[PDB]
Amino acid sequence: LIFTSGLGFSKGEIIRMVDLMISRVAGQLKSKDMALVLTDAAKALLAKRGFDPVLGARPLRRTIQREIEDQLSEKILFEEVGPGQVVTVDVDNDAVFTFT
Amino acid sequence: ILPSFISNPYNKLFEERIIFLGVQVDDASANDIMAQLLVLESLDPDRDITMYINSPGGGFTSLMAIYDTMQYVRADIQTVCLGQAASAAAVLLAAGTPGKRMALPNARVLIHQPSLSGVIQGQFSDLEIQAAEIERMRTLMETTLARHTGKDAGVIRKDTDRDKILTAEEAKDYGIIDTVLEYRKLS
Amino acid sequence: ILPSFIESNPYNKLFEERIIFLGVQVDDASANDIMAQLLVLESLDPDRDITMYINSPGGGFTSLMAIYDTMQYVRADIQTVCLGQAASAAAVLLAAGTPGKRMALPNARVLIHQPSLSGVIQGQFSDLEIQAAEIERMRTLMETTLARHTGKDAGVIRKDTDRDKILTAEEAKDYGIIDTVLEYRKLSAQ
Amino acid sequence: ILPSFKESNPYNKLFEERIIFLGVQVDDASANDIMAQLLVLESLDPDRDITMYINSPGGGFTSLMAIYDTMQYVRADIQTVCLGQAASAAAVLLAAGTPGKRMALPNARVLIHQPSLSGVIQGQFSDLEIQAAEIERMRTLMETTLARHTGKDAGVIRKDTDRDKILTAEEAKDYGIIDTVLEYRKLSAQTA
Amino acid sequence: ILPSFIESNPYNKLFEERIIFLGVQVDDASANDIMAQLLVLESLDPDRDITMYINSPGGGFTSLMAIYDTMQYVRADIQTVCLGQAASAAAVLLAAGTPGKRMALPNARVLIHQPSLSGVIQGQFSDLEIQAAEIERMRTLMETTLARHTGKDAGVIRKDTDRDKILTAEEAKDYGIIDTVLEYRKLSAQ
Amino acid sequence: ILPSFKESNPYNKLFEERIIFLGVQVDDASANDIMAQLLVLESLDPDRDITMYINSPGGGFTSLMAIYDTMQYVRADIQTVCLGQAASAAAVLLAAGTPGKRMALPNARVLIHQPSLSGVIQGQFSDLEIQAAEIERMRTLMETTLARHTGKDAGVIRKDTDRDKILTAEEAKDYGIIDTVLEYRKLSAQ
Amino acid sequence: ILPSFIESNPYNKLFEERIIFLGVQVDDASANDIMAQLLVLESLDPDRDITMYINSPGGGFTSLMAIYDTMQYVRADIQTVCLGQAASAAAVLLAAGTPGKRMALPNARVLIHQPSLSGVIQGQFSDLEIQAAEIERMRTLMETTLARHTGKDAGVIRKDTDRDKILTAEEAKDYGIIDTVLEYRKLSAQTA
Amino acid sequence: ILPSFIESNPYNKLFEERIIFLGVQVDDASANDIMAQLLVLESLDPDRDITMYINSPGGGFTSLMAIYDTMQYVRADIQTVCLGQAASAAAVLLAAGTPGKRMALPNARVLIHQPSLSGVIQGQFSDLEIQAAEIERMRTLMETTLARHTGKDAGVIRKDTDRDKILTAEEAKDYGIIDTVLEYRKLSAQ
């Protein structure tokens, strides 16, 4: 059995989780003859945007889907990324991702 | 006669995070304002606290109590002038969060240097102390208004040397408020 | 003694139907209460008119202008009914109702006169000239508001208000301060 | 010490039976309260009469006119009863009730007299002329109202009110200010 | 400091047994309270006697006449009990109770005297003729009321009340103001 | 400040225990309250003694006579206890308790003195000749009551009250005003 | 402004814990309140101690003796605690608590002095002699009370109270007015 | 006016968080209230600290000592915050909080000066000698407490507090009256 669960004038591993979560996308791309690589800055930005200290890693999956899966699918449909190519994800500059 | 409904209008305003500084600024009103500010901050620190000002001024230490409480709390403060803001109230009006100090079109602001009402008797060795304290309070008001209006203490001192009255627009050009409320009527 | 009934007294009942009673002197307390009531009423239903019963001998100028701004700012339209008398500041408030919704009972009375200083302000000539400038400013502001709301010209208002001007309901209607004089509803007299 | 007795007071019970007590000096406060009560009762049941008990020493003129206009405005009829006295403005209010529905108790007293300035107004002659004109206007308005509600000419009212006119209930009924003088309804007294 | 709790006030208990307490001066406020209570009790049970307790130093004349008319109008019999004193106006109220049901404790005193002016009325001699005529009318009305409720000629009352007349309970019974003198009902005493 | 604890104060709780407090100057306001309380307590249970605690400085004569008649009227026995003082009027009230149930704490005091008219009662000689007669009657009645309740003679009482007579608890007990001097109930002492 | 809480007041809470408060001048109103409170607390539980806090400048002699008799009369033992000061009458009351149970805070002061007649009593010499005899009697009675409750000859108290005598808590303990001077019970101080 | 909310008002909410507001003059009423609040809060939860907000011009000396003894007696740690000013007695109370938990807002003020006899005391020289000795004792006691809590020496306090000494928040911290000057918390413009 397992269970889970002032007024005023007072003062005086996440990168591993991101890798695991993007493992599914990387595998699906591999089935499509594609190799996904994420830079350290990209993983840091993904963790910053999608990791909620209050709610843990709950909003991380949707964040990855928003930032990578949607853009990657759009680019695949545009044919700008073809089978056998290595898809590298980088971050520039609030910031924004970019795919090579 | 203030008619209740269901609560009084003042309770309804307070629920919406509105504080009413509608009396003379003294110890009683200062304590009431401080208690309300602390309660509102505890209930929801993020949300802003509005503060309506229709007062003819008052004491200096009570002004500073209210001022410190307003600046201290986590919540942003938004000051409205309504009908008048004279002497202490003016400082409080200028003490709202920048960009969130507004006044009604026919409001009136009135800034002047601190004045002693009555006579303080005693030996010269005590009147020297009282004069030094009065100068300190005056300089403190100069510095607060200079901080919150973006004007040098010298300019503010020269301007407040004698009672200076400002309309809402003149107050805006003076840095005491940020906006003059346009009327909201649908016709 | 005002008798309640079944735990609502007459004033609360009037407030339920969006009626604000300015039956006292226009000062800080009354001004703050009236602002609070107008804001609450606007919040409850912005698209419903708010009635203002006026029976006041007037009062402060800053309080007048505060109530006036709140009336002109609320999204709802204000309808001002003068009962008994609307003198000095109150007159302006009666004139400041929504054009077409200003009313007075047949035997009511309106009084208009320029602002007057109560008591004596003592000081050096510099402070007194500052005060005189302020008082002229207040007088001109009252003239401007009345001219705006009655369709007269500021100069005509100035000349008319030099000395206390007392108008009956019909004369107030013909002056531009109200739109209609109320008619009785009794059926025995119909 | 006014006892209570749902818990209610005598005045609340009287209000529930559509009775308004004007037992104080007419002024802004009492005028506003009476107007609020009249409006409330008229809204509750427009076609049912409203009863006004008058035991008052008089009061102001603008307040009197507020109350008078409200009485004459409401859909419901007004039945005025003079209790112990009705002086100055209260006499006008007593005469302002609906014809046939104004009455006084046998030992009541009515007192009609012309408006009197309380105190003094000091100022320039150009302001005193304005004040005197307004006072004359109000005197004439009082005479016109009483003439309308008593059936007498304005000149007769002016002549009569020049100095304090005290009337009993019977003299008031003859004058025209009331229609009936109330009769006692004690059971023992009748059966004797 | 009267003992009550939230309201079992002893005056509430008395009123619930149809007892009205006139223990203060006879003025407009107390008069109006008394008439409201008499009317309320008459409505509650018209055919049950209403009791009045009179410990008052008297007061105004119009207020006296208001209370007197209400006492005579109501359908129920009024039983008056003088306890302490019944002076000036209150005396009439004591004598105005239903014949037979007028009582007083053994050590009560009843003061009867003619109406007197509270201060000075000033004005032209004509206004004073009017006021003096009114005062004479009021005095004659007092004599007539007491004559009606005591069985004595108005001339006798005028002669007797020309100057303060103080009567014990027994002298009041002989005079006709009351009918019985209460006898103590303490149990241990018998 | 008096703590509370239905909300009830100590005074109400004592009233529920059939205890009354005459701890203020005797007058109409206090006399009417005492009378209402006595009547209510008699109604609730007339076979149970009512304890009246007396710490008064005195008061009027008519109020004293009202309280005295009520005390002697109600069926329940009254037990008077003097705590700090019983001066002038209250002294009579202390002596008016049921024989055997009049007590005073050891340091209590009683003060008996003839009636006095503080202030001036002005008027013609023919009015002062009536006022003097009334005051003499009041003094004689006070003497007669004190003599009836103490067992002395009206003449002896009159002689003794010619000037302020101050009696301690033992002296009062010997004088007839009280019967027993309360002994302390403290358990630690005994 | 005294903050309530969820309800009661601090004073109601203290009363529930049997803590009377004599924080004002000893007059008839305060005496009646204190007497009512003592009688009520004796009724609720006669076998439990009653605490009485004394912060007062004194007051009337008769009120003093009323409160004194009531304290000595009830069945519950009384424990007095002097907080800010106990002057004139309130000193006697402070000494009137049960022996062993009279306490004072370290910085309290006890002011004992003979009775003084603020104001003027006029009258004939025949009345002034009576008044003077009464005043002497009350002075002697106060001396006897203090002698009884402090274990000192009444002559000693008479000589000592001839002029205002002010005593600190320790000096009062030496005198006899109190038994123990309260010690602070703050945890942080004890642990430091 | 002080709005309530759902029911309670701001002072009650502050109390529920163990906060006491000394916002009036230090006299017997405020002293008694503060002591009652301190004792209640101590009973509710001794371990938790009690906060005292000080904004007052001073007041009596024995009231000061009552509040001070209660603060130093209770089992809980007393934190103090000076808001607008702490003049005369209040300063002592401010300095009497637990070492480490005495705070003041940046623009607060702290006025300390020697005890002064308001009014005039009259009497013989042998009485004024006693009164002057008492005044000296009170002054020495004030200096002793201030030296004990500020760490200074009594002589230095006596020299400094001869005339009104006004210290700001930082000057007070240097003097030892407080420990920390509160820093603002506002999230915006952190």
PDB file of N, CA, C and O in Angstrom, chain B residues 52-89:
ATOM      1  N   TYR B  52      -7.756  55.556  -2.723  1.00  0.00           N
ATOM      2  CA  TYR B  52      -8.426  56.800  -3.059  1.00  0.00           C
ATOM      3  C   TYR B  52      -8.084  57.844  -2.012  1.00  0.00           C
ATOM      4  O   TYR B  52      -8.111  57.556  -0.813  1.00  0.00           O
ATOM      5  N   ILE B  53      -7.773  59.056  -2.462  1.00  0.00           N
ATOM      6  CA  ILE B  53      -7.287  60.120  -1.599  1.00  0.00           C
ATOM      7  C   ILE B  53      -8.186  61.329  -1.785  1.00  0.00           C
ATOM      8  O   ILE B  53      -8.259  61.889  -2.883  1.00  0.00           O
ATOM      9  N   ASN B  54      -8.869  61.731  -0.720  1.00  0.00           N
ATOM     10  CA  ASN B  54      -9.709  62.923  -0.720  1.00  0.00           C
ATOM     11  C   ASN B  54      -9.515  63.679   0.586  1.00  0.00           C
ATOM     12  O   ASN B  54     -10.467  64.137   1.215  1.00  0.00           O
ATOM     13  N   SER B  55      -8.272  63.821   1.006  1.00  0.00           N
ATOM     14  CA  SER B  55      -7.981  64.297   2.342  1.00  0.00           C
ATOM     15  C   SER B  55      -7.330  65.674   2.321  1.00  0.00           C
ATOM     16  O   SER B  55      -6.625  66.017   1.371  1.00  0.00           O
ATOM     17  N   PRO B  56      -7.542  66.481   3.356  1.00  0.00           N
ATOM     18  CA  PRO B  56      -6.883  67.789   3.452  1.00  0.00           C
ATOM     19  C   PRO B  56      -5.508  67.781   4.103  1.00  0.00           C
ATOM     20  O   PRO B  56      -5.042  68.848   4.508  1.00  0.00           O
ATOM     21  N   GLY B  57      -4.857  66.631   4.227  1.00  0.00           N
ATOM     22  CA  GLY B  57      -3.518  66.585   4.771  1.00  0.00           C
ATOM     23  C   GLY B  57      -3.504  66.173   6.223  1.00  0.00           C
ATOM     24  O   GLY B  57      -4.427  65.497   6.678  1.00  0.00           O
ATOM     25  N   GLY B  58      -2.473  66.555   6.956  1.00  0.00           N
ATOM     26  CA  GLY B  58      -2.421  66.273   8.371  1.00  0.00           C
ATOM     27  C   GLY B  58      -0.992  66.125   8.847  1.00  0.00           C
ATOM     28  O   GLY B  58      -0.069  66.663   8.252  1.00  0.00           O
ATOM     29  N   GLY B  59      -0.845  65.382   9.935  1.00  0.00           N
ATOM     30  CA  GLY B  59       0.433  65.264  10.603  1.00  0.00           C
ATOM     31  C   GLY B  59       1.523  64.781   9.678  1.00  0.00           C
ATOM     32  O   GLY B  59       1.294  64.326   8.562  1.00  0.00           O
ATOM     33  N   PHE B  60       2.751  64.893  10.170  1.00  0.00           N
ATOM     34  CA  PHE B  60       3.913  64.488   9.395  1.00  0.00           C
ATOM     35  C   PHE B  60       4.344  63.066   9.708  1.00  0.00           C
ATOM     36  O   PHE B  60       4.664  62.302   8.792  1.00  0.00           O
ATOM     37  N   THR B  61       4.366  62.692  10.984  1.00  0.00           N
ATOM     38  CA  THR B  61       4.759  61.338  11.346  1.00  0.00           C
ATOM     39  C   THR B  61       3.740  60.319  10.860  1.00  0.00           C
ATOM     40  O   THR B  61       4.112  59.224  10.425  1.00  0.00           O
ATOM     41  N   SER B  62       2.452  60.649  10.939  1.00  0.00           N
ATOM     42  CA  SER B  62       1.430  59.758  10.405  1.00  0.00           C
ATOM     43  C   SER B  62       1.572  59.601   8.898  1.00  0.00           C
ATOM     44  O   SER B  62       1.425  58.495   8.357  1.00  0.00           O
ATOM     45  N   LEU B  63       1.852  60.702   8.202  1.00  0.00           N
ATOM     46  CA  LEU B  63       2.182  60.628   6.787  1.00  0.00           C
ATOM     47  C   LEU B  63       3.288  59.620   6.550  1.00  0.00           C
ATOM     48  O   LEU B  63       3.203  58.790   5.642  1.00  0.00           O
ATOM     49  N   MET B  64       4.347  59.684   7.356  1.00  0.00           N
ATOM     50  CA  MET B  64       5.498  58.826   7.120  1.00  0.00           C
ATOM     51  C   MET B  64       5.197  57.378   7.458  1.00  0.00           C
ATOM     52  O   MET B  64       5.716  56.473   6.801  1.00  0.00           O
ATOM     53  N   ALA B  65       4.348  57.136   8.450  1.00  0.00           N
ATOM     54  CA  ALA B  65       3.903  55.776   8.717  1.00  0.00           C
ATOM     55  C   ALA B  65       3.171  55.201   7.515  1.00  0.00           C
ATOM     56  O   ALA B  65       3.489  54.101   7.041  1.00  0.00           O
ATOM     57  N   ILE B  66       2.187  55.939   7.000  1.00  0.00           N
ATOM     58  CA  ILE B  66       1.438  55.452   5.845  1.00  0.00           C
ATOM     59  C   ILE B  66       2.367  55.267   4.656  1.00  0.00           C
ATOM     60  O   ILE B  66       2.251  54.295   3.901  1.00  0.00           O
ATOM     61  N   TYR B  67       3.301  56.195   4.470  1.00  0.00           N
ATOM     62  CA  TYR B  67       4.211  56.135   3.336  1.00  0.00           C
ATOM     63  C   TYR B  67       5.098  54.900   3.407  1.00  0.00           C
ATOM     64  O   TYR B  67       5.262  54.177   2.415  1.00  0.00           O
ATOM     65  N   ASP B  68       5.681  54.640   4.576  1.00  0.00           N
ATOM     66  CA  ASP B  68       6.522  53.462   4.731  1.00  0.00           C
ATOM     67  C   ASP B  68       5.726  52.191   4.512  1.00  0.00           C
ATOM     68  O   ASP B  68       6.214  51.253   3.880  1.00  0.00           O
ATOM     69  N   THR B  69       4.503  52.127   5.034  1.00  0.00           N
ATOM     70  CA  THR B  69       3.705  50.929   4.811  1.00  0.00           C
ATOM     71  C   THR B  69       3.409  50.737   3.332  1.00  0.00           C
ATOM     72  O   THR B  69       3.472  49.615   2.821  1.00  0.00           O
ATOM     73  N   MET B  70       3.084  51.818   2.625  1.00  0.00           N
ATOM     74  CA  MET B  70       2.775  51.705   1.206  1.00  0.00           C
ATOM     75  C   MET B  70       3.976  51.203   0.424  1.00  0.00           C
ATOM     76  O   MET B  70       3.852  50.323  -0.433  1.00  0.00           O
ATOM     77  N   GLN B  71       5.154  51.759   0.698  1.00  0.00           N
ATOM     78  CA  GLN B  71       6.343  51.327  -0.026  1.00  0.00           C
ATOM     79  C   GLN B  71       6.774  49.928   0.382  1.00  0.00           C
ATOM     80  O   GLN B  71       7.368  49.205  -0.423  1.00  0.00           O
ATOM     81  N   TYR B  72       6.483  49.529   1.617  1.00  0.00           N
ATOM     82  CA  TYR B  72       6.986  48.267   2.139  1.00  0.00           C
ATOM     83  C   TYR B  72       6.285  47.078   1.502  1.00  0.00           C
ATOM     84  O   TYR B  72       6.932  46.111   1.094  1.00  0.00           O
ATOM     85  N   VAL B  73       4.959  47.135   1.403  1.00  0.00           N
ATOM     86  CA  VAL B  73       4.193  45.947   1.072  1.00  0.00           C
ATOM     87  C   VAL B  73       4.590  45.412  -0.297  1.00  0.00           C
ATOM     88  O   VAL B  73       5.084  46.142  -1.163  1.00  0.00           O
ATOM     89  N   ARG B  74       4.377  44.109  -0.485  1.00  0.00           N
ATOM     90  CA  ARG B  74       4.697  43.471  -1.753  1.00  0.00           C
ATOM     91  C   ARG B  74       3.782  43.945  -2.869  1.00  0.00           C
ATOM     92  O   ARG B  74       4.192  43.981  -4.033  1.00  0.00           O
ATOM     93  N   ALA B  75       2.546  44.296  -2.544  1.00  0.00           N
ATOM     94  CA  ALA B  75       1.574  44.645  -3.566  1.00  0.00           C
ATOM     95  C   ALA B  75       1.846  46.030  -4.125  1.00  0.00           C
ATOM     96  O   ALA B  75       2.261  46.938  -3.404  1.00  0.00           O
ATOM     97  N   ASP B  76       1.614  46.185  -5.420  1.00  0.00           N
ATOM     98  CA  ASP B  76       1.684  47.493  -6.045  1.00  0.00           C
ATOM     99  C   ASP B  76       0.519  48.355  -5.584  1.00  0.00           C
ATOM    100  O   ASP B  76      -0.585  47.865  -5.339  1.00  0.00           O
ATOM    101  N   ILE B  77       0.769  49.653  -5.468  1.00  0.00           N
ATOM    102  CA  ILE B  77      -0.221  50.610  -4.996  1.00  0.00           C
ATOM    103  C   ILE B  77      -0.556  51.559  -6.134  1.00  0.00           C
ATOM    104  O   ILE B  77       0.333  52.006  -6.864  1.00  0.00           O
ATOM    105  N   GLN B  78      -1.840  51.863  -6.281  1.00  0.00           N
ATOM    106  CA  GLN B  78      -2.333  52.749  -7.326  1.00  0.00           C
ATOM    107  C   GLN B  78      -3.160  53.840  -6.674  1.00  0.00           C
ATOM    108  O   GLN B  78      -4.219  53.555  -6.113  1.00  0.00           O
ATOM    109  N   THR B  79      -2.700  55.081  -6.766  1.00  0.00           N
ATOM    110  CA  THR B  79      -3.299  56.190  -6.040  1.00  0.00           C
ATOM    111  C   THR B  79      -4.179  57.019  -6.960  1.00  0.00           C
ATOM    112  O   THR B  79      -3.765  57.375  -8.066  1.00  0.00           O
ATOM    113  N   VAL B  80      -5.387  57.325  -6.496  1.00  0.00           N
ATOM    114  CA  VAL B  80      -6.318  58.199  -7.198  1.00  0.00           C
ATOM    115  C   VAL B  80      -6.597  59.399  -6.304  1.00  0.00           C
ATOM    116  O   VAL B  80      -6.577  59.286  -5.077  1.00  0.00           O
ATOM    117  N   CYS B  81      -6.853  60.555  -6.919  1.00  0.00           N
ATOM    118  CA  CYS B  81      -6.942  61.809  -6.177  1.00  0.00           C
ATOM    119  C   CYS B  81      -8.361  62.291  -5.922  1.00  0.00           C
ATOM    120  O   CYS B  81      -8.565  63.083  -4.997  1.00  0.00           O
ATOM    121  N   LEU B  82      -9.335  61.870  -6.714  1.00  0.00           N
ATOM    122  CA  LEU B  82     -10.725  62.209  -6.443  1.00  0.00           C
ATOM    123  C   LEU B  82     -10.959  63.711  -6.424  1.00  0.00           C
ATOM    124  O   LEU B  82     -11.127  64.326  -7.479  1.00  0.00           O
ATOM    125  N   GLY B  83     -10.975  64.311  -5.240  1.00  0.00           N
ATOM    126  CA  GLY B  83     -11.403  65.689  -5.115  1.00  0.00           C
ATOM    127  C   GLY B  83     -10.339  66.647  -4.635  1.00  0.00           C
ATOM    128  O   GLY B  83     -10.383  67.835  -4.955  1.00  0.00           O
ATOM    129  N   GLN B  84      -9.377  66.150  -3.869  1.00  0.00           N
ATOM    130  CA  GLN B  84      -8.357  67.008  -3.294  1.00  0.00           C
ATOM    131  C   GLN B  84      -7.249  66.136  -2.737  1.00  0.00           C
ATOM    132  O   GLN B  84      -7.487  64.996  -2.339  1.00  0.00           O
ATOM    133  N   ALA B  85      -6.037  66.680  -2.726  1.00  0.00           N
ATOM    134  CA  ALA B  85      -4.911  66.037  -2.058  1.00  0.00           C
ATOM    135  C   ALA B  85      -3.975  67.155  -1.624  1.00  0.00           C
ATOM    136  O   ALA B  85      -3.157  67.619  -2.419  1.00  0.00           O
ATOM    137  N   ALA B  86      -4.092  67.570  -0.371  1.00  0.00           N
ATOM    138  CA  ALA B  86      -3.385  68.730   0.137  1.00  0.00           C
ATOM    139  C   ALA B  86      -2.389  68.325   1.209  1.00  0.00           C
ATOM    140  O   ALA B  86      -2.706  67.527   2.095  1.00  0.00           O
ATOM    141  N   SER B  87      -1.186  68.884   1.123  1.00  0.00           N
ATOM    142  CA  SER B  87      -0.148  68.725   2.141  1.00  0.00           C
ATOM    143  C   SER B  87       0.243  67.255   2.192  1.00  0.00           C
ATOM    144  O   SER B  87       0.686  66.722   1.161  1.00  0.00           O
ATOM    145  N   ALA B  88       0.100  66.570   3.327  1.00  0.00           N
ATOM    146  CA  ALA B  88       0.575  65.199   3.440  1.00  0.00           C
ATOM    147  C   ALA B  88       0.020  64.333   2.324  1.00  0.00           C
ATOM    148  O   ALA B  88       0.757  63.575   1.684  1.00  0.00           O
ATOM    149  N   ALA B  89      -1.281  64.446   2.062  1.00  0.00           N
ATOM    150  CA  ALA B  89      -1.898  63.604   1.050  1.00  0.00           C
ATOM    151  C   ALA B  89      -1.146  63.693  -0.266  1.00  0.00           C
ATOM    152  O   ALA B  89      -0.926  62.677  -0.933  1.00  0.00           O
TER     153      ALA B  89
END
